Amino acid sequence: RQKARGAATRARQKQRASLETMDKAVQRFRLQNPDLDSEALLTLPLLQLVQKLQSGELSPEAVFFTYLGKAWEVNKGTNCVTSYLTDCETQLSQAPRQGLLYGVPVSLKECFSYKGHDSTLGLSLNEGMPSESDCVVVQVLKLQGAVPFVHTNVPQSMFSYDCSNPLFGQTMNPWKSSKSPGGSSGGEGALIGSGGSPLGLGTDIGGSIRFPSAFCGICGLKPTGNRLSKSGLKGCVYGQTAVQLSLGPMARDVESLALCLKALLCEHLFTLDPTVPPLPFREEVYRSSRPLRVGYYETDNYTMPSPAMRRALIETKQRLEAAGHTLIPFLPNNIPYALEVLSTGGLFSDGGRSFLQNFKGDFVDPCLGDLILILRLPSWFKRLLSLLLKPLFPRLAAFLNNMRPRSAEKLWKLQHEIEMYRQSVIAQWKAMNLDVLLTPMLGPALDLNTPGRATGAVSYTMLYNCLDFPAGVVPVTTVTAEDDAQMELYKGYFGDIWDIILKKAMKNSVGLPVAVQCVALPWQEELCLRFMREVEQLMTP
Numbered sequence: 359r360q361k362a363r364g365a366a367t368r369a370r371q372k373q374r375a376s377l378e379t380m381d382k383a384v385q386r387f388r389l390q391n392p393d394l395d396s397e398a399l400l401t402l403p404l405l406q407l408v409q410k411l412q413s414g415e416l417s418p419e420a421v422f423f424t425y426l427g428k429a430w431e432v433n434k435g436t437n438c439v440t441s442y443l444t445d446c447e448t449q450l451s452q453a454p455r456q457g458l459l460y461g462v463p464v465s466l467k468e469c470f471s472y473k474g475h476d477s478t479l480g481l482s483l484n485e486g487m488p489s490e491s492d493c494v495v496v497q498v499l500k501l502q503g504a505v506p507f508v509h510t511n512v513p514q515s516m517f518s519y520d521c522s523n524p525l526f527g528q529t530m531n532p533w534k535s536s537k538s539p540g541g542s543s544g545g546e547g548a549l550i551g552s553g554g555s556p557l558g559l560g561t562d563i564g565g566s567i568r569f570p571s572a573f574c575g576i577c578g579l580k581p582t583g584n585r586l587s588k589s590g591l592k593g594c595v596y597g598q599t600a601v602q603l604s605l606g607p608m609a610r611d612v613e614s615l616a617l618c619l620k621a622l623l624c625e626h627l628f629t630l631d632p633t634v635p636p637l638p639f640r641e642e643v644y645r646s647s648r649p650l651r652v653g654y655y656e657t658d659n660y661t662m663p664s665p666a667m668r669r670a671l672i673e674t675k676q677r678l679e680a681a682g683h684t685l686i687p688f689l690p691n692n693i694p695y696a697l698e699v700l701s702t703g704g705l706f707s708d709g710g711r712s713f714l715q716n717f718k719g720d721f722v723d724p725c726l727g728d729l730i731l732i733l734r735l736p737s738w739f740k741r742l743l744s745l746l747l748k749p750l751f752p753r754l755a756a757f758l759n760n761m762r763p764r765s766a767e768k769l770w771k772l773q774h775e776i777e778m779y780r781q782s783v784i785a786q787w788k789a790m791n792l793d794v795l796l797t798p799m800l801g802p803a804l805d806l807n808t809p810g811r812a813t814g815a816v817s818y819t820m821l822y823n824c825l826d827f828p829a830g831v832v833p834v835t836t837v838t839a840e841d842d843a844q845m846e847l848y849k850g851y852f853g854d855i856w857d858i859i860l861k862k863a864m865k866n867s868v869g870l871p872v873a874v875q876c877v878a879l880p881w882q883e884e885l886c887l888r889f890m891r892e893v894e895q896l897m898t899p
């Protein structure tokens with residue numbers, strides 16, 4: 359193991375030196391600017407901030423070093439920053455003046471490659487392997503005048519909805535230090551959720567923008583997979599195309615997400631990665647205020663919602679009704695198949711073997727639970743264990759049986775099944791003539807080191823990765839004393855270990871934020887945002 363302890367020791371040196379460097383930059387600026395009203399600057403909504411940077415009434419230096427100071431402050435209680443992107447102070451002086459994000463500091467999940475910086479993903483084998491260049495989206499941020507300034511922490515390998523790794527340690531939820539911030543984009547959740555960044559980018563293959571956004575009380579959007587460029591994104595496995603990775607924005611409000619997508623969907627993006635269809639942001643769809651046919655469900659019949667989740671969904675449904683929208687009960691067909699056969703099978707078509715090589719000679723962070731141990735089991739044993747457990751615990755059995763290695767021949771068949779399911783749900787959708795779909799979102803924040811074992815709780819988000827529909831989350835309420843007391847009677851639909859862990863993990867959550875999820879059809883990001891904007895305006899005043 360000693361090569362892996364060396365990786366951790368070096369990564370902590372680097373993190374500390376980064377935080378030290380931030381502190382010294384911050385102190386230098388405050389010394390020269392003792393009268394700046396930093397709290398008034400920090401609490402400006404992004405749109406007003408961009409307006410003020412663009413007119414010249416706030417300088418980029420003032421915005422940048424004030425935020426940088428807030429990031430360092432909030433990092434003390436959250437451990438969300440892994441690295442300071444040193445050259446950002448000279449990017450700040452060169453920021454294209456007409457750019458739609460001129461002078462906006464932006465946070466990046468660690469997997470977004472940045473020249474001269476590791477994208478470790480918490481894995482020892484990626485330590486001391488700096489990126490040769492910025493990834494495409496980061497290039498596009500800079501060309502629109504933004505100032506990427508920190509890399510934020512992720513769970514090891516990015517395959518947990520918690521956020522700890524053996525290199526930089528454990529990130530914490532800013533609302534409550536005993537709670538997870540979510541993941542894998544958890545560092546972003548904590549930073550943005552505590553006020554230390556007005557905008558960041560995350561990734562999401564099973565819910566990893568939406569979990570942290572919902573747990574930390576902020577907005578996030580997972581677009582259609584190929585709406586933005588993945589060129590230069592660091593990952594654990596490459597070439598898996600049945601369940602797509604998507605990237606999108608995280609921010610305090612929905613208008614920030616719209617601004618960000620609008621800034622990214624420009625000629626710079628489309629010429630830097632011609633493989634992305636050149637679909638400009640359709641402002642008129644986003645700004646529409648016509649009544650919507652909104653499908654909805656209180657539950658997916660897979661993960662029993664928390665009382666807080668249920669109340670969030672029902673109150674949102676009612677308030678949308680009062681505004682003139684038509685609410686239509688709607689549950690996508692065959693969710694169990696989509697999760698257990700299609701999703702699992704798509705993510706682990708090779709039995710997890712490629713994924714597992716990343717851990718050779720490495721520690722396994724406890725927030726991954728027993729994932730590594732289970733994936734390591736021989737195919738024949740996965741099958742036998744599956745058959746043993748089927749009459750007792752059919753969910754665990756299904757999971758085990760669908761994470762076995764298979765032939766290219768069977769992967770073709772699975773990929774076709776994924777296509778056909780997508781056409782199935784689209785057909786279901788168009789028969790009830792929906793515009794959008796309102797669902798519960800997992801919440802409130804689970805206890806630290808529990809997402810690794812509450813594996814079924816991914817059901818609410820994973821469905822829309824499998825379907826590759828754009829999905830976003832918006833905070834609508836906070837857990838009440840009554841909501842939390844009612845957790846005592848939570849039973850789950852199955853009563854397996856996944857339900858038992860989730861039950862305990864969601865207790866002691868008074869005051870934590872709770873979200874709903876908003877879905878549209880593929881390529882309809884503008885409509886998803888329009889809907890999100892509506893939920894935000896009616897529920898959070």
Ligand SMILES: *C(=O)N1CCC(Cc2cccc(Oc3ccc(C(F)(F)F)cn3)c2)CC1
Nearest residue numbers: 517518519542562563564565566697698814
């Ligand atoms: C962020 O995008 N992510 C990706 C998903 C992980 C959570 C996770 C860990 C291990 C396996 C899976 O996949 C999966 C598929 C189906 C089911 C079900 F059938 F629902 F039980 C469960 N898990 C997801 C978090 C970070």
Ligand SMILES: [Cl-]
Nearest residue numbers: 584633634635
């Ligand atoms: Cl495409």
